[PDB]
Design an enzyme around this catalytic site. Structure first.
Site, mmCIF file in Angstrom:
data_model
loop_
_atom_site.group_PDB
_atom_site.id
_atom_site.type_symbol
_atom_site.label_atom_id
_atom_site.label_comp_id
_atom_site.label_asym_id
_atom_site.label_seq_id
_atom_site.Cartn_x
_atom_site.Cartn_y
_atom_site.Cartn_z
ATOM 1 N N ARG A 84 -34.565 -1.807 30.176
ATOM 2 C CA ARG A 84 -34.669 -1.228 31.609
ATOM 3 C C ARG A 84 -35.830 -1.902 32.522
ATOM 4 O O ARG A 84 -36.402 -1.378 33.326
ATOM 5 C CB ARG A 84 -34.949 0.283 31.456
ATOM 6 C CG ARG A 84 -33.654 1.136 31.024
ATOM 7 C CD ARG A 84 -34.119 2.554 30.667
ATOM 8 N NE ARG A 84 -33.204 3.127 30.180
ATOM 9 C CZ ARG A 84 -31.875 3.497 30.680
ATOM 10 N NH1 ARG A 84 -31.710 3.033 31.951
ATOM 11 N NH2 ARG A 84 -31.003 4.266 29.953
ATOM 12 N N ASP A 121 -30.233 0.997 39.041
ATOM 13 C CA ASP A 121 -31.521 0.443 38.633
ATOM 14 C C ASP A 121 -31.144 -1.107 38.614
ATOM 15 O O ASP A 121 -32.109 -1.973 39.253
ATOM 16 C CB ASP A 121 -32.241 0.834 37.601
ATOM 17 C CG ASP A 121 -32.448 2.328 37.510
ATOM 18 O OD1 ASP A 121 -33.194 2.869 38.230
ATOM 19 O OD2 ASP A 121 -32.391 3.234 36.564
ATOM 20 N N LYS A 154 -21.726 -0.949 36.299
ATOM 21 C CA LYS A 154 -21.741 -0.160 34.887
ATOM 22 C C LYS A 154 -22.516 1.297 35.026
ATOM 23 O O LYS A 154 -23.663 1.276 35.585
ATOM 24 C CB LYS A 154 -22.689 -1.023 33.632
ATOM 25 C CG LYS A 154 -23.107 -0.384 32.332
ATOM 26 C CD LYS A 154 -24.275 -0.284 31.901
ATOM 27 C CE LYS A 154 -25.145 0.772 32.754
ATOM 28 N NZ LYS A 154 -26.598 0.753 32.176
ATOM 29 N N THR A 155 -21.860 2.221 34.352
ATOM 30 C CA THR A 155 -22.823 3.390 33.918
ATOM 31 C C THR A 155 -21.783 4.633 33.672
ATOM 32 O O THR A 155 -20.756 4.989 34.288
ATOM 33 C CB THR A 155 -23.807 3.963 35.030
ATOM 34 O OG1 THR A 155 -24.580 4.974 34.318
ATOM 35 C CG2 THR A 155 -23.286 4.135 36.434
ATOM 36 N N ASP A 160 -22.730 7.511 33.786
ATOM 37 C CA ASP A 160 -23.105 8.578 34.796
ATOM 38 C C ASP A 160 -22.437 8.607 36.038
ATOM 39 O O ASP A 160 -22.397 9.517 36.766
ATOM 40 C CB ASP A 160 -24.601 8.444 34.897
ATOM 41 C CG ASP A 160 -25.558 8.556 33.753
ATOM 42 O OD1 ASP A 160 -25.076 8.883 32.760
ATOM 43 O OD2 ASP A 160 -26.690 8.024 33.937
ATOM 44 N N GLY A 211 -28.956 1.635 29.892
ATOM 45 C CA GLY A 211 -28.483 2.141 28.677
ATOM 46 C C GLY A 211 -26.991 1.789 28.597
ATOM 47 O O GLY A 211 -26.249 1.484 29.701
#
Ligand SMILES: O=P(O)(O)OC[C@H]1O[C@](O)(COP(=O)(O)O)[C@@H](O)[C@@H]1O
Lengths: 552, 551
Positions: B143, B174, B200-201, B203, B79
């Site tokens: 993904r 991931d 990166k994220t 979250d 994402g």
């Protein structure tokens, strides 16, 4: 609260040059003799003491005022919040205190009901300071009680008198600006000397005309919605798998939807007013959305963004006809429904409906079929319904999936349709106002006091030339009757100010029509940012596309 | 868009070290490393890149492992997160600085782009239009999980045919799982192709002692908190609505907790605490109802609740149910092959154990179907689809029932008017804050320096993130230290372990200290929109989480 809030609090809203002058140095310039939209005749009856008042403008030079003593003013917020309401209030406060430091401002709580109940607080300097340039209506809270009965109107006056008020300012939409007119007439009819001033509030832009260029709050709300919509377009473009459907709050018009479309270039945007005008069917709307999806899929683009206004289903002629029929099949055959079950009584409607309306009814999702029955089974005493139980975006999504599922089975759709729905509204109406709404609202409130200081009642505070820098804006007043008509309801004719809807001949709509097929099939998204409050003047004082096109 | 035009001109701020000549930046090797758990089995699998040294940069000479122009490949994964385009612009600016004849190639749609040799050359004019923008749309993302010998063969063939010195992979847990194994493959087989990961994220579940935060979390939580603050102010203004806000975050509650510390909502659920206290769904419900009743007795018939999307994986009874549904599908897949969702439900119900069937059937029907879809729409790495599950609507329905139960005894006289929201997709491709703009540019520029110094299997790492950018420390963390063994698609595999909320951490402890206060009173804070021009103070704001964590 946050660092943002403390810094924003220190912002000085920009006035019209004329409102910067001393109160002794601001002269009235009278206008013509206004007339109502229609029923020019009956509006002379209802509004005997107020009617055909001239339009007021302000210019520099010496003048004598209607007060020298301290003023006491009551202030009411009615309806849903709009960014900048608190600045109308800061503007009124700053204006009366300049005039005389002994002047007082009283804020009635939770709408017009606060006035009826004498539920109020004095807005002091330190209190006012904490609310400067903030979002919300939470300084006093809002409501929407109407003042109707003779018992009510007499209490309004009672409470006004025992609080020693010289004037009342009502901040609201169409219906409270109408009420403001009748209260002004009521005081004047009974020989009292309390002035009433109206202020044009609505994030939906459904209060406007030749004199009111825009309502307050629409600039700030659409900026927030367009930032969020632009962000969804960019996300859609990045991962290429989701069709985002965005419903925007407000059931009356497409002003908000149209502006966000001009800001973001979505693949699809539906305009209610056009749907009504071209008498489109539900299946036509669905056909048209499906065709854009298929074409993009053939370009290899399995993604997009749709914008729909909340009040859309109420603008489909076919749906009202289906509704008016179903309850005619209910008002007749009354005893046949006992006693019934629904799903069993659904097939009663299904067997009794006209051939074509049965095709429309059964085309709907199953849960929608049942929600329409419930809509009828709950009509108000006057027997009239609404279709609030059907959510526009979710209706469209399910019907689209269905059409596409069938096409896939007979091998004419190779793509993937994965919908995500969004509903924005509550997170835009109590946001921090842009510089525009901050300047505009502060100006309207400050201007309201100048109107009061010249003895005027029954006027709406008005600022024009809003596309120019604020120093160049023009200040005045519009009489409330001239915006009115008589509306006939249940044997009665009460005065009203009608909702301004999207003008299908206007520059905004025409701009959208000119470019929508190109936006539909290609990826020409624009990405607006969050509202900026620091930096260059052209970023921080940007106005809506709507206002930019309409004026010029 | 006038905003985009002005913002495009921002010059991201670098660590002082990264401003020096590349023949002036020397390594500092340090502490050796190991995995988090299952260290034994991970030492078999990662035989060539285990236990590498922590890296830092300082003013000096250094041995430069390249004298000729570089060819780099770059991958955007999972994402979006605001600032991915500044990672890319930092790589480009660095390789052009090093040698103007250097070329950067962007693989399209994630790792699949590498496998299918689908790429574009990222040139100076292309990079220019993306500087400081949101999105992953320069090359798009996906993904895809690279596992098989054939996939790695393919990855190798494409890499070698494109004359690539190095591959830079930008993504989450991931994707850095992919990157760790790819670096190991290239080494084990004897090739000179370097692989650098970037953290990166939105979250923030990619975290350790060395990686202080993942990029994008700052920007995303800022937009989500603006909106929640706006809802809090609307609730205060009108005094009638109970807003239930679902938030992205995947498993961890880092996003939810940050937004709570930014806004002071009346309720924020922390999934990690729910699991620690082994709460049932019914118990969570009753605790929320109690807050609602108390406020109502106080005359406040309104409020705001934050709900993390990952909650269902942390309630023991629901987690257990989801694992059994998964097990049932994975073992009887052919029965489900053609069927609709109603016919699927019938099989799932027939095959559940009696305890689990009672749990499942106690949920509202709409939740019953969404749980199935959660399982069916597992991503290539085996994650459930929690974003599609309307957890906030489940809360509303169950709370609605309990309040009616109290009303039936005259114990609740208010009217409950709930409003659902889900802030997520609208925050991922937003314009990055100065923090993320500065941090991302530094991370990409830093990955080049690591490449120039011959490293592979490392995460680009910028430390001291609470300080002015000039005072940031640049370097590298070996990817293996973040790893452990987990079961995905019924099988045990090496993954980056997700970093969850630390219940002994300063962020959670600050929340617990004040949460009861925030429940009964109206102590909302109203953050504004992210500011990009103006006073150093408002423009260079950081998260509550990062401040507390580095304190
Ligand atoms: O984009 P999708 O496929 O709908 O998946 C949603 C997930 O992606 C995220 O937005 C980001 O996840 P990653 O940063 O780990 O890629 C999560 O918050 C959310 O659970």
């Amino acid at each position: 609260t946050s660092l943002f809030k403390q810094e924003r609090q220190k912002y000085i809203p920009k006035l019209p040059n004329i409102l910067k002058k001393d109160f002794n140095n601001i002269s009235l310039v009278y206008g013509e003799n206004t007339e109502a939209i229609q029923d020019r005749q009956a509006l002379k009856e209802f509004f005997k003491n107020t009617y055909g008042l001239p339009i007021i403008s302000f210019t520099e030079g010496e003048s004598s005022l209607s007060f020298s003593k301290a003023l006491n003013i009551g202030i009411i917020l009615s309806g849903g919040p709009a960014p900048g309401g608190h600045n109308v209030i800061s503007g009124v406060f700053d204006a009366i205190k300049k005039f005389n430091p002994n002047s007082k401002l009283f804020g009635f709580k939770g709408g017009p009901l606060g006035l009826l109940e004498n539920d109020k607080i004095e807005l002091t300097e330190s209190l006012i300071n904490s609310y400067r340039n903030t979002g919300g209506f939470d300084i006093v809270s809002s409501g929407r009680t109407k003042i109707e009965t003779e018992e009510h109107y007499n209490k309004a006056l009672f409470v006004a008198k025992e609080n020693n008020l010289n004037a009342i300012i009502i901040i609201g939409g169409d219906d409270s600006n109408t009420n403001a007119a009748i209260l002004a007439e009521y005081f004047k009819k009974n020989g009292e000397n309390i002035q009433v001033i109206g202020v044009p509030k609505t994030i939906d832009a459904d209060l406007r005309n030749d004199h009111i260029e825009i309502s307050f709050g629409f600039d700030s709300a659409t900026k927030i919605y367009s930032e969020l919509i632009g962000n969804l377009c960019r996300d859609a473009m990045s991962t290429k798998k989701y069709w985002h459907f965005v419903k925007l709050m407000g059931r009356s018009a497409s002003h908000v939807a149209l502006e966000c479309a001009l800001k973001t270039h979505p693949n699809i945007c539906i305009v209610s007013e056009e749907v009504l005008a071209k008498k489109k069917t539900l299946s036509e709307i669905i056909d048209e959305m499906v065709s854009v999806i298929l074409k993009r899929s053939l370009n290899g683009d399995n993604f997009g963004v749709v914008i729909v206004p909340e009040g859309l289903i109420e603008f489909i002629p076919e749906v009202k006809s289906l509704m008016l029929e179903l309850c005619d099949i209910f008002d007749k055959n009354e005893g046949e429904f006992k006693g019934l079950n629904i799903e069993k009584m659904k097939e009663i409607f299904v067997a009794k409906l006209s051939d074509y309306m049965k095709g429309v009814y059964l085309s709907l999702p199953l849960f929608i079929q049942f929600e329409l029955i419930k809509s009828i089974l709950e009509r108000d005493p006057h027997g009239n319904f609404n279709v609030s139980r059907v959510p526009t975006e979710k209706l469209f999504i399910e019907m689209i999936q269905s059409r596409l599922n069938d096409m896939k089975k007979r091998g004419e759709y190779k793509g993937s349709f994965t919908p995500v729905d969004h509903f924005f509204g509550y997170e835009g109406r109590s946001a921090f106002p842009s510089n525009f709404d901050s300047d505009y609202c502060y100006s309207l409130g400050y201007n309201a006091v100048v109107l009061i200081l010249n003895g005027l009642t029954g006027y709406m505070s008005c600022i024009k030339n809003l596309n120019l820098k604020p120093t160049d804006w023009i200040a005045g007043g519009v009489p409330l009757t001239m915006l009115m008509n008589m509306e006939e309801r249940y044997g009665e004719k009460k005065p009203v100010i009608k909702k301004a809807l999207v003008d299908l001949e206007g520059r905004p709509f025409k701009e959208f029509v000119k470019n929508r097929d190109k936006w539909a099939l290609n990826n020409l998204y624009l990405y607006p940012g969050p509202v900026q409050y620091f930096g260059s003047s052209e970023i921080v004082d940007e106005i809506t596309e709507t206002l930019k096109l309409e004026l010029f």
